[PDB]
């Protein structure tokens, strides 16, 4: 996929694969573009 979830991706330079709560709320999110760095590279999961 290239508009839903690629992986592996780089959350703000943290690196991740599947979704990730990262301290969210009983859930998590996924990264759209490969590198995240905050470049609208995600969506909540």
UniProtKB/Swiss-Prot annotation:
<feature type="disulfide bond">
    <location>
        <begin position="5"/>
        <end position="30"/>
    </location>
</feature>
<feature type="disulfide bond">
    <location>
        <begin position="19"/>
        <end position="45"/>
    </location>
</feature>
<comment type="similarity">
    <text>Belongs to the seminal plasma protein family.</text>
</comment>
<comment type="function">
    <text>Could enhance the fertilizing capacity of bull spermatozoa upon interaction with heparin-like glycosaminoglycans present in the female genital tract. Exhibits both simulatory and inhibitory actions on the release of pituitary gonadotropins.</text>
</comment>
<feature type="domain" description="Fibronectin type-II 2">
    <location>
        <begin position="1"/>
        <end position="45"/>
    </location>
</feature>
<protein>
    <recommendedName>
        <fullName>Seminal plasma protein PDC-109</fullName>
    </recommendedName>
</protein>
<comment type="subunit">
    <text>Homodimer.</text>
</comment>
């Amino acid at each position: 996929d290239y508009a839903k979830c690629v992986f592996p991706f780089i959350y703000g330079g943290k690196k991740y694969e599947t979704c990730t709560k990262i301290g969210s709320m009983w859930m998590s999110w996924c990264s759209l573009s490969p590198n995240y760095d905050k470049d609208r590279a995600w969506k909540y999961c």
